[PDB]
Structure 1
């Protein structure tokens, strides 16, 4: 009866696919229809809201393709008597200050970034790399808070663990995907012939994967590369390959939680003016590798591997 939207910036990522899946679940439970829309850019975002209004949706969950669209999104929604909840990516104002007023569901970015770093360092030690000939490549998306806090967290952890600060090289990526990250990593690789072993730091699976792909192209074998993604669900195809690669593992979050919970809260809000908490931080994480990925997915009920 009631129709609620679930707008995602990147429909191609398993992460977002899963959030859609679990929105559908909440829909069945509570008795609402979820309208699933891809919003890969600003225009499509604004158009999509119009479209929702036409369909008579009461509200929407959104992961905006651009945090800086926040103001506009709110203005449009307001106009249509729509309630908004942000998932994953927080709205910011013109100045890049967060819009605290919009309820947000997100991962504990910093904490998860830090776990990445810890796990990078641990695996390095396991392999017995000489620090003197090792480096960290940090592929950054500093314009996105959530991404920033992951990669910063990771670098902080590595530094805390005793990885030499001066051997940490950052490079911005133009896009938060494989192609973008590849390009970025490549440009950094050719700058540093002296490095024999790389740690790859990136905010998510795709970013790290791009990094890994570049290293391979520059004649690094798996043993000499450690990349640990974040998302988990996005990494399955990699972890499924016959042969081990530079991509060691991924930190599996809870896209299920993000999808279901964001939806359920909106409904309660729309249906019963039950005001959501402003901020919901999801702290779940588990390292999945070649050995355990299958169990851990099935254990979290994201079956298939």
Structure 2
């Protein structure tokens, strides 16, 4: 009967696959169908709205490939009498200011990046690294606010704990994936032969994974690297390997809550003109490592090694 879309920029990430799964659960519970579409670029984004219109959908949840497409997405949706909810990446206008009137569901990005920095520091302490030969590699995607809030929160936490500001090195990545992060990390590694141990800061698991893979290629053993990702579900293949690596763990937020809650809220809005809150910040987070990832995922209903 009722058709609602769930559009995501990166279907290759377990993070979005999970949102899709829980959106389906919400459809089952409330009685609506979820049209799952990948929107990796702006063109596909706009064409997908047209497809949704053709299928008769009344609204959609979207994680845009580009926050700057916000105006256009809103324009096309108003044109088809569709309600829109943003999940994870906030829409911004042309000047980069947030489109506050579009309901948003997202993680507490600043708080989670601060936790990442706290946990990096703690593990560094446990390994007893001499600060003098250690450094932080921050792989940033500053044009994406949610990404920026995580890496800045993480760097601020490290500086608050006493990590030397001058030994915090930032390098921008061209893509939010392993290859982009790899490339960025490699260029930074060869510039710092004096560093014997590295803390890798990145907004999500893929970003940290690319950083870790680059350190391996420059001869660092796992004991000299500490990378803590963000997303959790995206690090299960790494945490499942026989051997420990420089990727120590990941902060697991709630993609399950994001998929179900944004879908539910869309539904209520469409079916009963029940207006969603403008901002829903989910604060859940748990650190998953090789030692507790299975238990923790099972514990969250994301069952499977």
TM-score by length of 2: 1.00
1:112 matched residue in structure 2: 112
Q: List structure 1 segments (4+ residues) > 3 angstroms apart after TM superposition.
A: none
**Alpha-carbon offset, residue 254 of structure 1:** 0.4
**Alpha-carbon offset, residue 88 of structure 1:** 0.2
**Alpha-carbon offset, residue 238 of structure 1:** 0.1
**Alpha-carbon offset, residue 127 of structure 1:** 0.1
Distance in 1, Cα, partners of 2:299 & 2:216: 32
Distance in 1, Cα, partners of 2:294 & 2:206: 19
**Alpha-carbon offset, residue 8 of structure 1:** 0.1
Question: Is the partner of 1:291 in helix, strand or coil?
Answer: coil
Deviation sequence 1:166-204 (CA, Å, 0-9, x none):
000000000000000000000000000000000000000
Distance in 1, Cα, partners of 2:303 & 2:218: 35
Distance in 1, Cα, partners of 2:25 & 2:294: 22
Distance in 1, Cα, partners of 2:208 & 2:80: 40
Question: Is the partner of 1:237 in helix, strand or coil?
Answer: helix
Deviation sequence 1:257-300 (CA, Å, 0-9, x none):
00000000000000000000000000000000000000000001
Distance in 2, Cα, partners of 1:145 & 1:197: 29
**Alpha-carbon offset, residue 38 of structure 1:** 0.0
**Alpha-carbon offset, residue 24 of structure 1:** 0.1
Distance in 2, Cα, partners of 1:63 & 1:182: 24
Give matches, 1:86-235, under 5 Å. Answer: 86-235=86-235
Distance in 1, Cα, partners of 2:90 & 2:82: 18
**Alpha-carbon offset, residue 56 of structure 1:** 0.3
TM-score by length of 1: 1.00
2:265 matched residue in structure 1: 265
Question: Is the partner of 2:132 in helix, strand or coil?
Answer: helix
Deviation sequence 1:80-106 (CA, Å, 0-9, x none):
000000000000000000000000000
1:240 matched residue in structure 2: 240
Give matches, 1:289-300, under 5 Å. Answer: 289-300=289-300
Deviation sequence 1:232-257 (CA, Å, 0-9, x none):
00000000000000000000010000
Distance in 2, Cα, partners of 1:214 & 1:33: 42
